[PDB]
Nucleic acid binder design. Structure first.
Ligand SMILES: Nc1ncnc2c1ncn2[C@@H]1O[C@H](C[C@@H](N)CC[C@H](N)C(=O)O)[C@@H](O)[C@H]1O
Ligand SMILES: [Zn+2]
Ligand SMILES: [Zn+2]
Ligand SMILES: [Zn+2]
Lengths: 218, 109, 94, 78, 104, 97, 79, 109, 95
DNA sequence: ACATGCACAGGATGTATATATCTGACACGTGCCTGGAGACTAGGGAGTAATCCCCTTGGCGGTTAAAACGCGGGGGACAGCGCGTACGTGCGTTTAAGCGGTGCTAGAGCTGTCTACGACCAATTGAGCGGCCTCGGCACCGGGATTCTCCAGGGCGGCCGCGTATAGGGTC
DNA sequence: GACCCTATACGCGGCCGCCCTGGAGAATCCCGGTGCCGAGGCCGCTCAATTGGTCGTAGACAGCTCTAGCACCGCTTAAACGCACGTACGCGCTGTCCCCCGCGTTTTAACCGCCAAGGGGATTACTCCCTAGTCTCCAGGCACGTGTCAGATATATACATCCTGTGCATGT
């Protein structure tokens, strides 16, 4: 029918005893781009924040509003929809061609700790839950896109992917964004390598379909 | 007498002409100190202080601060060519450095 | 509990003259004291050597002027000379 | 072995402020030697001044005079 | 029926390095710990005269001077490295910098 | 047809000029250069012969020290030839401009 | 008057030889003329300052010596 | 009165204690000059001169010359470590350079 | 008319004949020795001068000269110069 | 008759901003008291004039060393490639710095006293400076003796091609 | 089962890279004259060092206060440390090609020596005004104290977009 219901949230939601590190607007990096430039803080320019996976801030960036480096807070996700996959569940396909390096989406969910993460994995084993949305953003902080998330949680693993997860630092805190690693024409389903999923369990088979498929998730 | 009138006032200066005169006298630079030597020296010291303080205030305004801190003095000195040359061999406590990354260390396409 | 002379009040007077609404930290004021003492010592020493080279017993405004030209780089020297000669012109006529 | 208290992270930070991206692993010990030389010279002269004033305590002005004597004028301590 | 977290790609080598470059060229703090530097200072001073005492401002001045010296030295040695078509600084670079400066 | 190999006369000259204590720039060219540099500071200047000789001695010492540092810079880059970038690196590290 | 060209290429080669330099790129001569001119300009500027302060129209060897000493390049053998 | 006895003879020096005393007094170093300051300074100058001249005479002998010339002073100064630290920023007229060639430039075997 | 120009030539020559009896010295080398003695005199004198000013004294004594010797001279030069000057002072005051 | 598609009044919390409270950081205000300023004088340093008389500038002419120029070619600069490992990134533990508070005492920093050292002055006299002269140390030259570099041909270690010896396999 | 066809490494020189001297210039040293000019030794004199005595204050020495330097202890927690991993950078090797060196020929201008000439540095004589020294006196600047006014800042109350759940319109 439809995917099981989830609270479609827009920004990371902390939970339990997790704690963000949000810095003040004075101590976020500022580049050297100028508002008169050809593409201030643009994708292909030499923005010193873009090169270092830093997100510009319109109230700090010297380019003011000409800064094309606010792709996280402004949420310029290219339009995409959800389609049931062969034997993986639901994936997503965009609405247009994507040139290599276009910010595709941002992974977002509920911020949990390590012991809460293992509690949720235990509870999932108790009810043979097979879909897992965890993604370790760092020690003591894991994203869980299970209950709360966005469309990005509907991207599947493929051993030869067309997207990837990169960590950016936005407003002084880490966030994870899905980026395009190759020129993806529309109609093509989007998929990134989870890059690890084995904690202690039986390594669910990887029915990705890549030529170099590792068979399992690893 | 006639209402002492503080030579700095007579020169139109803010720095102390009398104190500079006394420091020249009690400092073993020559056995005599001219009348206009302290005036000249106080004027030059005031001019250089005004130059540095103006540049440092500009820098402190670039950071949207209303106090000059050693960082701003350092930024003013290093970002001005002649002030940099005058104070090249000087270290400013709590100054830091100019932000500068060589062009070869930057990530490439 | 003893007196300690400093250039702080004069530095602050010059500050209010150029940036009337900007303050200055205590550490920055200390740095400005050190700066004024350093430059004073440089100029006074160079002028003292200038007197001794020419075998004169007097440090005059002429030798302070020449000490400024040696020690200051270019535009700083020109403006410092102009400022000092205006101060001496104004002082001697009062 | 207090020169070992100038740890590797400290030297890496000092290299970062100098604009250094990659650091060979032989740098650290080398850098310590450099530091321990510089320090020595300055402290030598500082103690000299301290002994000439017949003080048992090394004053910040002694350090400042030593540094200026070595051509490394320091503003902010006197 | 496995579970297990996913892991984002670690930063490419040289990205946290450049982040640190910008961070430490933006700040003015002291980059060495203070107790270790003070212990080293006292140990070095024991060779010149025993039972010495230090003013706190004396040790702070020493730290400021040494840290500024090392930062300038690292700037020159980075220039040497880049001259040699490298981006890694090596002991030979420090030695060339100090020889040209005059210390060696 | 006999001819030395490219680098032995250079070493011969290195030894010959590191053995000698003499001025390597000509006298009249350096003197005219000094006068034309001094024209832009004050006109109608005179020059004691010892003044121009001291200037030449100092300038030659300067350039010899600079070339030593430049040679070290070139050797650092695994070259034998000195190039302008080596002079620039030497002068930058020294403290000059 | 291109008097800086009188510091000829062979003279620069000799100064390089006394410095231990074996092989010399052909772009070194203009660079070295520029370096020499800058240094000479600084020293002559300070020497002419010393000369004018003494009201003299002749630059003496001591003026050069004082200029060098104040630039940190002390020179023994002229006074 | 006693005939005379130059203070150098009293101190056992070859350098002039009296002339050094006058130079200290007429150089504007301080307002008073102690009795032993010129004596100490003349001794130190004499020691340093003797050290340099010893090394320069050795250098002259090593070149089969019996008369010191600036080249020998240069060789003595640059070959000694302490005198090279002391005179590291000094140029010696007509002194030349030490004979140093880098090992990478020598012809490969 | 012809004014007298002082120099350390005779004293440098006296010291030379102590340490190398059969050795002469060129006029240019003697000029270099004059410049050397004047340079070292000025360094020690200036260092002791400002060393007196730091301590708020007005007298340049043998203690000032001694400390200026330790500051300016390296290692063994400093040790031997200090000992020599101390000897000359301690034998000056016994006559 | 009925539940699919889908909404609209109420809740509800992120969202945006007014609001009472801290914590300094300086900002005026006294209160002194020490050090500039006024006033005046004495004498020596500096300025001016005159004069000498070195020494810098300019010219001329010849000699010849040196720079300029051309050219072949060798070797070094420099671009490209591959690999392997060293260093950067990140995690999990451990350690020790930093902070705060407490407590004690060495010794910095000042005052008071007085003495013995240094400035200063006048007379005296010998050391050091300018001038002058000479003779030996060194510079230069020239011819012969080593010494060092360079390259053309021979031995001395290869692997290397080619004919060849040794043994597997098919057949009578 | 033996005999002949046939493949495959075996050794036998077969040229080769590649040292190794041998000899030819070229350069550098070495040694004897030769002469020349500057080191160095002496003379005369003058002016600066020495002798002696006087006087004032700098500093040494003792003594005291109270600052700040050191020693310690307990807690928090950030930083350092050790290890795993993986890639991108350093470094070695190769080729190519250009540019700099070595050498020969031509050209030019430095250099040497000699000669004037006059500019300007050095010296001397006066002189006059500018600075030190001094004494008196008052206010400028410093120490300490407390107000004021920010930013910062956690508190708290209204607003804006989302969330809800059963009811409105409807195709079965
Ligand atoms: N390539 C794949 N083949 C088979 N199953 C997959 C694959 N990728 C993801 N999954 C399943 O999807 C889960 C990962 C989750 N992010 C869910 C993604 C999935 N598209 C969904 O939203 O339901 C895992 O628990 C797997 O069971
Ligand atoms: Zn930008
Ligand atoms: Zn931007
Ligand atoms: Zn797969």
């Amino acid at each position: 029918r439809k995917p099981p219901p989830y609270k479609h949230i827009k920004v990371n939601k902390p939970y339990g005893k997790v704690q963000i590190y949000t810095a003040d607007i004075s101590e976020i990096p500022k580049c050297n781009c100028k508002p008169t430039d050809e593409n201030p803080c643009g994708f292909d320019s030499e923005c010193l924040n873009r090169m270092l996976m830093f997100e510009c801030h319109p109230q700090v960036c010297p380019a003011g509003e000409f800064c094309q480096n606010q792709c996280f807070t402004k949420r310029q996700y290219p339009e995409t929809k959800i389609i049931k996959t062969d034997g993986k569940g639901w994936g997503l396909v965009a609405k247009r061609d994507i040139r290599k390096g276009e910010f595709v989406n941002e992974y977002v969910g509920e911020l949990i700790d390590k012991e809460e993460c293992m509690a949720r994995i235990k509870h999932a084993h108790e009810n043979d839950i097979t879909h897992f949305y965890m993604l370790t953003i760092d020690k003591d902080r894991i994203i869980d896109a299970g209950p709360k998330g966005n469309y990005s949680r509907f991207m599947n693993h493929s051993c030869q992917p067309n997207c990837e997860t990169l960590k950016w630092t936005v407003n002084g805190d880490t966030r994870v964004g899905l980026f395009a690693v190759c020129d993806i024409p529309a109609g093509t389903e989007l998929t990134f390598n989870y890059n690890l999923d084995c904690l202690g369990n039986e390594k669910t088979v990887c029915r990705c379909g890549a030529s170099n498929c590792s068979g399992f998730l690893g | 007498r006639a209402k002492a009138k503080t030579r700095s006032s007579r020169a139109g200066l803010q720095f102390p002409v009398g104190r500079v005169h006394r420091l020249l006298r009690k400092g073993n630079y020559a056995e005599r100190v001219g009348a206009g030597a302290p005036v000249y020296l106080a004027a030059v010291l005031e001019y250089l202080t005004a130059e540095i303080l103006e540049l440092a205030g500009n820098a402190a305004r670039d950071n949207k601060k209303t106090r000059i801190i050693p960082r701003h003095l350092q930024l003013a000195i290093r970002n001005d060519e002649e002030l940099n040359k005058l104070l090249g061999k000087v270290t400013i406590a709590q100054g830091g450095v100019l932000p500068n990354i060589q062009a070869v260390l930057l990530p490439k396409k | 509990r003893s007196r300690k002379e400093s250039y702080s009040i004069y530095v602050y007077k010059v500050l209010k003259q150029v940036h009337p609404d900007t303050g200055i930290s205590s550490k920055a004021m200390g740095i400005m004291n050190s700066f004024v003492n350093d430059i004073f010592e440089r100029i006074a020493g160079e002028a003292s050597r200038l007197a001794h080279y020419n075998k004169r017993s007097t440090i005059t405004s002429r030798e302070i002027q020449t000490a400024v030209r040696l020690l200051l780089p270019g535009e700083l020297a020109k403006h410092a000379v102009s400022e000092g000669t205006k101060a001496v012109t104004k002082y001697t006529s009062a | 072995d207090n020169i070992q208290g100038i740890t590797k992270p400290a030297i890496r930070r000092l290299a970062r402020r100098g604009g250094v991206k990659r650091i060979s692993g032989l740098i650290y010990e080398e850098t310590r030697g450099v530091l321990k030389v510089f320090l020595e010279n300055v402290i030598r002269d500082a103690v000299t001044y301290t002994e000439h004033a017949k003080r048992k305590t090394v004053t910040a002005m002694d350090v400042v005079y030593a540094l200026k004597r070595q051509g490394r004028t320091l503003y902010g301590f006197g | 029926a496995t579970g297990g977290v996913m892991k984002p790609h670690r930063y490419r080598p040289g990205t946290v390095a450049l982040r640190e470059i910008r961070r430490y060229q933006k700040s003015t703090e002291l980059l060495i710990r203070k107790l270790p530097f003070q212990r080293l200072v006292r140990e070095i001073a024991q060779d010149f005269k025993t039972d010495l005492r230090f003013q706190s401002s004396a040790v702070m001045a020493l730290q400021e001077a040494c840290e500024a010296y090392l930062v300038g030295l690292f700037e020159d040695t980075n220039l040497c490295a880049i001259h040699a078509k490298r981006v890694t600084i090596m002991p030979k670079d420090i030695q060339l910098a100090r020889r040209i400066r005059g210390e060696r």
